[PDB]
Design an enzyme around this catalytic site. Sequence first.
Site, mmCIF file in Angstrom:
data_model
loop_
_atom_site.group_PDB
_atom_site.id
_atom_site.type_symbol
_atom_site.label_atom_id
_atom_site.label_comp_id
_atom_site.label_asym_id
_atom_site.label_seq_id
_atom_site.Cartn_x
_atom_site.Cartn_y
_atom_site.Cartn_z
ATOM 1 C CB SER A 47 -1.032 -0.008 1.429
ATOM 2 O OG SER A 47 -1.979 -1.139 0.751
ATOM 3 C CB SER A 95 -4.559 0.991 2.871
ATOM 4 O OG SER A 95 -2.930 1.577 4.281
ATOM 5 C CB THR A 186 0.850 1.478 7.067
ATOM 6 O OG1 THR A 186 -0.031 2.410 7.014
ATOM 7 C CG2 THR A 186 1.470 2.143 8.133
ATOM 8 C CG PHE A 188 0.615 -6.233 6.243
ATOM 9 C CD1 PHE A 188 1.515 -6.765 5.629
ATOM 10 C CD2 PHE A 188 -0.960 -6.712 6.435
ATOM 11 C CE1 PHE A 188 1.768 -8.245 6.265
ATOM 12 C CE2 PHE A 188 -0.551 -8.262 7.442
ATOM 13 C CZ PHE A 188 0.603 -8.623 7.008
#
Lengths: 245, 246
Positions: A47, A95, A186, A188
Amino acid sequence: SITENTSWNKEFSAEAVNGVFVLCKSSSKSCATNDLARASKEYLPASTFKIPNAIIGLETGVIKNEHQVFKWDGKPRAMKQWERDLTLRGAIQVSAVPVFQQIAREVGEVRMQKYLKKFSYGNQNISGGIDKFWLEGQLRISAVNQVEFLESLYLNKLSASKENQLIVKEALVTEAAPEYLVHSKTGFSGVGTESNPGVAWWVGWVEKETEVYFFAFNMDIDNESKLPLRKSIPTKIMESEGIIG
Amino acid sequence: SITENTSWNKEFSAEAVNGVFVLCKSSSKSCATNDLARASKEYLPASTFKIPNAIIGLETGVIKNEHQVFKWDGKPRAMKQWERDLTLRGAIQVSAVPVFQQIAREVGEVRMQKYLKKFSYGNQNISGGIDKFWLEGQLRISAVNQVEFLESLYLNKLSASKENQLIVKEALVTEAAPEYLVHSKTGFSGVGTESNPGVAWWVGWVEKETEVYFFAFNMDIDNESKLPLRKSIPTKIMESEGIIGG
């Protein structure tokens, strides 16, 4: 010129984390990291790709302006937090992958390739499907390249309008005080497997008084419970350097 | 059009205060206030004037860009809070006077007057000295006019580049969460006396999920201890409207 700060590994050894932190004061010509080798190793952006994708969406007109609302069609999404209408900022901050998958489809491969070349974005390999190349495809970028890209954005030096750069920057604000401002994102990719783990990221910049610090963190991750370390390890390192509100 | 909600007077009376709150959902065509009369009364803007002043600074080239640093020359300032180098955002948020006095001087009266006409900014009366008209001079603006001006800024509709409007907007961010963002600015003319009060302001907008709310608050201030009410009264009203929580 990047240097290796061995003391910064202390924060990684405690959690048995294999990762890297890159921190630059003022500009990318003044950087330090815990791991020189890993600093330029390239990983799926996950992201964190919403930063260039949003700029490209605005540049191409796919995204009308900063007040575009992305309406939810009421159909199931992978995260409950995504099951609602979202602004551009909201979609970035929570996100919301499906919003950005549809943006990427509308941008299309030819334009996406052109902008990633302009932005010098990692290996610039968008194979793997136009709506999944940054999630499970072939695209890779290092922590050092993230800081270079973010510095360009901070300076309005990307090949995009200043207006569109400014729009995306306000969307990235995550901490605000009169003399302290953080822009961050962020990422992941998932947990992969023990032998082929996923990757987690935190990238951004901090403005404290009249100084600016650019940063990028990534780590291998095979257990979702370790996810918060993507913010806490960099934050502990930054706070130890006096970068705190 | 603007409606009166007198039930909001409770929030002011409890705490000593004579004041007004204007709150608008989506646009300035859907506004409510505790006091229609006071909502249109015009008061000294004090440091809420930093919003137009910053835009004008950028438009005229007096302020170079978003990254300009306002350096302290080392001479003492009213406040030690300001005896430091500041960014544009910093100068707006710590409410650094001397920075904005110099900006005003450089802009000049003719240009300042021109832009306040374009912005429809209050009574547009900038007599009182070019570096103090918003602090001690004749300039006055109402809470309704503040909302109208802020809505124009939000929409990039002021007579200024979109880039400069965006720069000033980021400088106004005061609270941030993924689906909740506040742009705001305080002002305070000084602590007056009971018979001749000062004015305190809080103005801004709240983006909550996909909605936007514009707001402007002012109150008479005759006691230093009451200053924080400029944020707590609006917060309580907005909480009662369901804006703060969920």
